[PDB]
């Protein structure tokens, strides 16, 4: 009745959310990133902006947030505010008019092994090159370039959870059918930072328009 409070107090007594959660600073933080697409909210063709409801699952091990379950009556998992812990600064590179990073700091699930699972919701309003040629029978290929903004690949390595986005919770859109989806990890060198390649995962969705509305009202 006081053991979970004791655990939280012991973990964070001198925890630092500034330093990376590794035993040794030369180690790399291995972050698993899984984009879950909940709903294709909008595809703004004229503004070339795609609005999507997503869950950006992030998983990593915090070396300092381990505990022994026997010390706390077998407590093997706890929920803690994400603002207290170190987090990967995943930024949507191709943001058009939304937020770059996560702003809804939900609680993370922390396990006795130090494994943190964070699944914050986000509404990504990403830029997409709307190809007009075959409209209204066009297929659109819209993508989300997600990566750690300040941590480079030698410092925090992000890895895709799966080759494809998690569409299991996808609310079927009445205008667009996702014919294909895939996630590709890339390392690229920016002119800002020529000696350190930065990792990103570009999730992409091949969306085909359902033409029936435009067939009826235009064609």
């Amino acid at each position, epitope marked *: 009745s006081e053991h979970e409070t004791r655990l939280v107090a012991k973990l964070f007594k001198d925890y630092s959310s500034v330093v990376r959660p590794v035993e040794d600073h030369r180690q790399v933080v291995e972050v698993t990133v899984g984009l879950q697409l909940i709903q294709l909210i909008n595809v703004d063709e004229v503004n070339q902006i795609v609005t999507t409801n997503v869950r950006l699952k992030q998983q990593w091990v915090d070396y300092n947030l381990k505990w*022994n379950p026997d010390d706390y009556g077998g407590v093997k998992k706890i929920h803690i505010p994400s603002e207290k812990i170190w987090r990967p600064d995943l930024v949507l590179y191709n943001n058009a008019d939304g937020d770059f990073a996560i702003v809804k700091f939900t609680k993370v699930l922390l396990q006795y092994t130090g494994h943190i699972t964070w699944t914050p919701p986000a509404i990504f309003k990403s830029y997409c090159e709307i190809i007009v040629t075959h409209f209204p029978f066009d297929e659109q290929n819209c993508s989300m370039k997600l990566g750690t903004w300040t941590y480079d690949g030698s410092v925090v390595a992000i890895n895709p959870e799966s080759d494809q986005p998690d569409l299991s919770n996808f609310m079927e859109s009445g205008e667009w059918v996702i014919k294909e989806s895939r996630g590709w990890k890339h390392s690229v060198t920016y002119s800002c930072c020529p000696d350190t390649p930065y990792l990103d995962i570009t999730y992409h969705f091949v969306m085909q328009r359902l033409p029936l509305y435009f067939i009826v009202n235009v064609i």
Partner: antibody
Framework: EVQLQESGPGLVQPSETLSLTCTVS????????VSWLRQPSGKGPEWMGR???????VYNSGLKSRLSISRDTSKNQVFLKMNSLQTDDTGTYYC??????????????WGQGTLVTVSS | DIVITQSPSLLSASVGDRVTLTCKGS??????LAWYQQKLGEAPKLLIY???SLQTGIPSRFSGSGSGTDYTLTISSLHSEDLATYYC????????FGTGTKLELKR
């Protein structure tokens, strides 16, 4: 500097209640946890429970019903009390000061240990 | 919890010999292994924690090594002071102790 001394009855009747006092010197119970260990005869040691620095307690799940732990921070004493004693409880009982790193704890110092024999 | 085994159960070595006691778990102990020295009728004394952190005041002849599920305690030169029983124990998931290795001077 740091020393711990277990004390208690060397012989206890079965189904009686064992009581042990871990006397403490060289440190304050308010800043160091005290764990209790026992080594049954012919077996490796096992962890019984801990008195936390904050005054809480935790017990081995096999002994949680049989154990209570308490302390007196003015006397620098930690008390173990165990009931429903059985022949298999015969062994050497240690109290240990626990070091910590964040939430992880380990036994850094041992007392000399008190041999407890349970026989009618 | 992580089951722990030690070998040898009994080891004989002469003063000055290098000895390497071994400790092996059933699961990844993640370097959260400690070693302590117990003598008959004496309070056990912690030698090493986190598999290689030497306890303050322990002679430098003691050193620890290992990773994953296999760990070792090395005495670089056995003194007569060091004839004792050595237990490894694990504190990352529950608390489990080895059976202990008893160390005797060779005769």
């Amino acid at each position: 500097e740091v020393q711990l001394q277990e004390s208690g009855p060397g012989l206890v009747q079965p189904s009686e209640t064992l009581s042990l006092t871990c006397t403490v010197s060289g440190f304050s119970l308010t800043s160091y946890s005290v764990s209790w260990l026992r080594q049954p005869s012919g077996k490796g040691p096992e962890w019984m429970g801990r008195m936390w620095d904050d005054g809480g307690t935790v017990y081995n799940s096999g002994l949680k019903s049989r154990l209570s732990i308490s302390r007196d921070t003015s006397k620098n004493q930690v008390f173990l009390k165990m009931n429903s004693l059985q022949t298999d409880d015969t062994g050497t009982y240690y109290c240990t000061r626990d070091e910590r790193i964040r939430a992880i704890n380990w036994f850094a110092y041992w007392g000399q240990g008190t041999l407890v024999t349970v026989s009618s | 919890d992580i089951v722990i085994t030690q070998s040898p159960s009994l080891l004989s070595a002469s003063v000055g010999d290098r000895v390497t006691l071994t400790c092996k778990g059933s699961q990844n102990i993640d370097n959260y292994l400690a070693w302590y020295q117990q003598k008959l009728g004496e309070a056990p004394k912690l030698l090493i924690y986190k598999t290689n952190s030497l306890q303050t005041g322990i002679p430098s002849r003691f050193s620890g090594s290992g990773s994953g599920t296999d760990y070792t305690l090395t005495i670089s030169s056995l003194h007569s002071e060091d004839l004792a029983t050595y237990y490894c124990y694990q504190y990352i998931n529950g608390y489990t102790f080895g059976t202990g290795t008893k160390l005797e001077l060779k005769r």
